[PDB]
Write an enzyme that holds these catalytic residues in place. Structure first.
Site, PDB file in Angstrom:
ATOM      1  N   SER A 554      26.170 -22.523 -28.743  1.00  0.00           N
ATOM      2  CA  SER A 554      26.140 -21.819 -27.460  1.00  0.00           C
ATOM      3  C   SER A 554      26.471 -20.339 -27.704  1.00  0.00           C
ATOM      4  O   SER A 554      25.706 -19.649 -28.388  1.00  0.00           O
ATOM      5  CB  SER A 554      27.095 -22.508 -26.487  1.00  0.00           C
ATOM      6  OG  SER A 554      26.703 -22.213 -25.165  1.00  0.00           O
ATOM      7  N   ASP A 641      18.278 -29.114 -22.534  1.00  0.00           N
ATOM      8  CA  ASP A 641      19.424 -28.224 -22.511  1.00  0.00           C
ATOM      9  C   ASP A 641      19.214 -27.196 -21.407  1.00  0.00           C
ATOM     10  O   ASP A 641      18.651 -26.111 -21.636  1.00  0.00           O
ATOM     11  CB  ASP A 641      19.662 -27.508 -23.837  1.00  0.00           C
ATOM     12  CG  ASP A 641      20.924 -26.650 -23.805  1.00  0.00           C
ATOM     13  OD1 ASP A 641      21.520 -26.483 -22.718  1.00  0.00           O
ATOM     14  OD2 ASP A 641      21.332 -26.163 -24.866  1.00  0.00           O
ATOM     15  N   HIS A 680      22.658 -29.676 -23.726  1.00  0.00           N
ATOM     16  CA  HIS A 680      23.585 -28.766 -24.369  1.00  0.00           C
ATOM     17  C   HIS A 680      24.559 -29.422 -25.325  1.00  0.00           C
ATOM     18  O   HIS A 680      25.002 -28.780 -26.287  1.00  0.00           O
ATOM     19  CB  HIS A 680      24.333 -27.976 -23.304  1.00  0.00           C
ATOM     20  CG  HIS A 680      24.874 -26.675 -23.809  1.00  0.00           C
ATOM     21  ND1 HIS A 680      24.093 -25.721 -24.419  1.00  0.00           N
ATOM     22  CD2 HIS A 680      26.132 -26.175 -23.773  1.00  0.00           C
ATOM     23  CE1 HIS A 680      24.839 -24.684 -24.741  1.00  0.00           C
ATOM     24  NE2 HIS A 680      26.085 -24.931 -24.360  1.00  0.00           N
TER      25      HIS A 680
END
Length: 710
Positions: A554, A641, A680
């Protein structure tokens, strides 16, 4: 080594946009459409070369087998009591999703309460949030499919674990709070939108509203309690005070640790919850965080960072609300961050501090804030806790780099408040005493001392011969504390590696000042700190550039991708997971608008000037020196995601392959893997977790020519 050809990828050379006078070409802008045949073909073509590359060497299979064996250990969460029953999560070892159990007493036989595994063959349906009614007789739980942030809230009557018909849709980034009368529950939902809402879309999320669902009714009857039509980015989460008298609304905009705090005395509603509540705007600005701890009548205890970057506890009396009147219950520590606080057994406060990136846990008196008891802990983190105001005991879970951890229990009705080991599991196959964890502080470019944990086998010679795995995040006030990772320990034991975690600026390790030291105009400090961590490992002999792998996910993906562009000579391998790569357009998709508090937004000339200098997608450049090439790079993302839309990694890999991959001196691979039915990361099933770490370490092994050590 590269026995494959990079896929043909069309360059739209007409895709030019002016940003404050600077012309920016985005030839792969078309990859922003996840549904096109062109993008689907791109993903298929990329996976077609990546998979065989990762699976060619026998090491992936060896790693996978070892991971499957070692990760197979009983995993328990702390017990927590709701009403007259105890609950806890437990995974026997390799179940795709942990299971929620219930028992009528600590000594009672436990039974399955909620098993997400039966909801899908592959375990891609996962629990995402839950809330028990105040009396513990009813239960609300969110379900997310394929890793998407979207949630569907379902309900159950606890006694008999009976499924109820209530279903709430359009839920995302939601609170879940039952009123104490047991009539219903507050939650958040987004208005209907064109296109899909399954995690594959990129549509921006705005106008989140606060609703109240009355149990036994259709969602269409839900009451709208708060909305901010003039402020599309505001998000208001509700929670009930411990006595059930007040609904507290915490309004956030962006990602900084700040929030508006409005309250509603439910007794003052004209006829119950029938519409927009009579909100009293106690704190009506975004200048500080106010995290509710407990209240005694109108005296509310909040954990805050208002003029206290390391956090403190204050009491605000709703009847005399001016700031000049607030009382400081537990003053801010000069250096230790007060991470979280809980109220238990009516008048006790459990305070968890972060002291040089290690947790401490203690009990204080609610009335005076005086320290009463220190709960002894080894070096590590507190990752779980239970104990609400009406409870008379606490449970807390500790973990560290070398051991799964321990769950402790403390009966607070006992005079001395002595804790005891409640649950302790050890992983057969890994001997903790064979390794050690050291903490050092290295100076960054500007001289700031940055903490770094290093885990390695005892007695190694610091001759620079060891493969190293350096991890970092650096942002959003998130502290990267010790955690148990079987995958990383396999790298240490079976690949002879050294693990390192650098607590770079942008995180919350040293409070809000640490956070501000790595955001906005200072974002480069993060990259400098991380690059310096690598330089420290190399200078001190833990590793060498050609044997060093960096990893982040991320905002951490942004970290390592930027480091690859800025210092390709410092790393041998880079694994960027679900990373934000297009810093000029990140704010346009899903919840990306919230990250502008850490990054800034390209609409601003000042911000654009910061962003353009480090944006991974805009800084891919052939190293000037003939002897320098880019490190081997592997980007990992997934098609659902919706937190960090995959287009970030798609555009970045296309750019890497074209600009750098075409060069004759580039022999290190630049690959991407796009998984299916995953997002994610949260809620990812065990099977996928195992495949992912196997891909990661197989990539490292093949690129750095590392043999497996049985």
């Amino acid at each position: 080594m590269l026995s494959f050809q990079y896929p043909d990828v069309y360059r739209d050379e007409t895709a030019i946009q002016d940003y404050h006078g600077h012309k920016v070409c985005d030839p792969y802008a078309w990859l922003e459409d996840p549904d096109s045949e062109q993008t689907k073909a791109f993903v298929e073509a990329q996976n077609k070369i990546t998979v065989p590359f990762l699976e060619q060497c026998p090491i992936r299979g060896l790693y996978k087998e070892r991971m499957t064996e070692l990760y197979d250990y009983p995993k328990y969460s702390c017990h927590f009591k709701k009403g007259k029953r105890y609950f806890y999560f437990y995974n026997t070892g390799l179940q795709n999703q942990r299971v929620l159990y219930v028992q009528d007493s600590l000594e009672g036989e436990a039974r399955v309460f909620l098993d997400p595994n039966i909801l899908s063959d592959d375990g891609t349906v996962a629990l995402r949030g839950y809330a028990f009614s105040e009396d513990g007789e009813y239960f609300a739980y969110g379900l997310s499919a394929s890793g998407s942030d979207w949630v569907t809230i379902k309900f159950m009557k606890v006694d008999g674990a009976k499924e109820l018909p209530d279903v709430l849709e359009r839920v995302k980034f939601s609170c879940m709070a039952w009123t104490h009368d047991g009539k219903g529950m507050f939650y958040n939902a987004y208005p209907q939108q064109d296109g899909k809402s399954d995690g594959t879309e990129t549509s921006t999320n705005l106008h989140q509203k606060l609703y109240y669902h009355v149990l036994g009714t259709d969602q269409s009857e839900d009451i709208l309690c708060a909305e901010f039509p003039d402020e599309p980015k505001w998000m208001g989460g509700a929670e009930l005070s411990d006595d059930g008298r007040y609904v507290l609304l915490s309004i956030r905009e962006g990602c900084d640790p700040v929030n508006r705090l409005w309250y509603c005395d439910l007794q003052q509603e004209s006829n119950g919850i029938t519409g927009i509540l009579k909100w009293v705007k106690l704190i009506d600005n975004f200048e500080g965080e106010y995290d509710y701890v407990t209240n005694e009548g109108t005296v509310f205890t909040f954990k805050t960072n208002r003029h206290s970057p390391n956090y403190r506890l204050i009491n605000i009396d709703f009847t005399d609300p001016e700031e000049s009147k607030w009382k400081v219950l537990v003053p801010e520590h000069e250096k230790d961050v007060l991470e979280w606080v809980a109220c238990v057994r009516s008048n006790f406060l459990v305070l968890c501090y972060l002291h040089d990136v290690k947790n401490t846990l203690q009990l204080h008196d609610l009335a005076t804030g005086a320290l009463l008891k220190i709960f002894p802990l080894e070096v590590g983190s507190v990752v779980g806790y239970s104990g609400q105001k009406k409870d008379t005991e606490i449970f807390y879970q500790f973990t560290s780099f070398l051991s799964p951890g321990i769950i402790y229990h403390c009966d607070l009705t006992k005079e001395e408040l002595e804790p005891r080991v409640f649950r302790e599991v050890t992983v057969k196959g890994i001997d903790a005493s064979d390794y050690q964890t050291v903490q050092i502080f290295y100076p960054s470019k500007d001289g700031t001392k940055i903490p770094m944990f290093i885990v390695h086998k005892k007695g190694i010679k610091l001759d620079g011969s060891h493969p190293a795995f350096l991890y970092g995040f650096g942002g959003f006030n998130i502290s990267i504390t010790p955690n148990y990772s079987v995958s990383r320990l396999i790298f240490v034991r079976h690949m002879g590696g050294v693990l390192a975690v650098a607590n770079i600026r942008g995180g919350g390790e040293y409070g809000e000042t640490w956070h501000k030291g790595g955001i906005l105009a200072n974002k480069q400090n993060c990259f400098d700190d991380f690059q310096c961590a690598a330089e420290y490992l190399i200078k001190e002999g833990y590793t060498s550039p050609k044997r060093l792998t960096i990893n982040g996910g991320s905002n951490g993906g942004l970290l390592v991708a930027t480091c690859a562009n800025q210092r390709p000579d410092l790393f041998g391998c880079v694994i960027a997971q679900v990373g934000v790569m297009d810093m000029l357009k990140f704010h346009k998709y899903t919840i990306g608008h919230a990250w502008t508090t850490d990054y800034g937004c390209s609409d601003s000339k000042q911000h654009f000037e910061w962003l353009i200098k480090y944006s991974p997608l805009h800084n891919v450049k052939l190293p000037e020196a003939d002897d320098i090439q880019y490190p081997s790079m592997l980007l990992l993302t997934a098609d659902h995601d919706d937190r960090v839309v995959p287009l970030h990694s798609l555009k970045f890999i296309a750019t890497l392959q074209y600009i750098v991959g075409r060069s004759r001196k580039q022999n290190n691979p630049l690959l991407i893997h796009v998984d299916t039915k995953a997002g994610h990361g949260a809620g990812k099933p065990t099977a996928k977790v195992i495949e992912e770490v196997s891909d990661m370490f197989a990539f490292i092994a093949r690129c750095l020519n590392i043999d497996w050590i049985p």
